[PDB]
Curated annotation (Swiss-Prot), chain A:
Entry similarity comment: Belongs to the herpesviridae glycoprotein B family.
Free-text function comment from the UniProt entry: Envelope glycoprotein that plays a role in host cell entry, cell to-cell virus transmission, and fusion of infected cells. May be involved in the initial attachment via binding to heparan sulfate together with the gM/gN complex that binds heparin with higher affinity. Interacts with host integrin ITGB1, PDGFRA and EGFR that likely serve as postattachment entry receptors. Also participates in the fusion of viral and cellular membranes leading to virus entry into the host cell. Membrane fusion is mediated by the fusion machinery composed at least of gB and the heterodimer gH/gL.
Species name: Human cytomegalovirus (strain Towne) (HHV-5)
Subunit structure: Homotrimer; disulfide-linked. Binds to heparan sulfate proteoglycans. Interacts with gH/gL heterodimer. Interacts with host C-type lectin CD209/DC-SIGN. Interacts with host ITGB1, EGFR, and PDGFRA.
Compartments reported by the entry: Virion membrane; Host cell membrane; Host endosome membrane; Host Golgi apparatus membrane
Entry PTM: A proteolytic cleavage by host furin generates two subunits that remain linked by disulfide bonds.
Superkingdom of source: Viruses
Record's protein name: Envelope glycoprotein B
Region (Involved in fusion and/or binding to host membrane): 26-30
Amino acid sequence: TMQLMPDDYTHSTRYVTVKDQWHSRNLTRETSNLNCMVTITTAR
Amino acid sequence: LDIDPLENTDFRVLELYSQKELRSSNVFDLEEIMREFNSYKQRVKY
C-alpha cells in the first residue's frame, strides 16, 4: 500500500503517491514508474 | 401662470451584472484552462 501526500501549486488540489521519477542502468531495460494521484478541480 | 421649472436629474450609470460576475458565468473559462494546461505541462521531476 502507498499513502497519498500533497503536490505543489492553481484552482486544482492534487495528492500523489510518488513525487519523483526513477530508472537504472546490460541490454535495453524498461523501468515502470507507477503513480496514483488524486486531484480536485472546481467544476461549473 | 405659476409654472414650476423642471428639476435637473442626474442619470446614474446603471450596472446590472458585475464584471467579476460576468466571467463568473461561463462554464468554460479559457484563462483557467490554458493555465490548467501549463500546470500539467510541468509534471516531470527526477
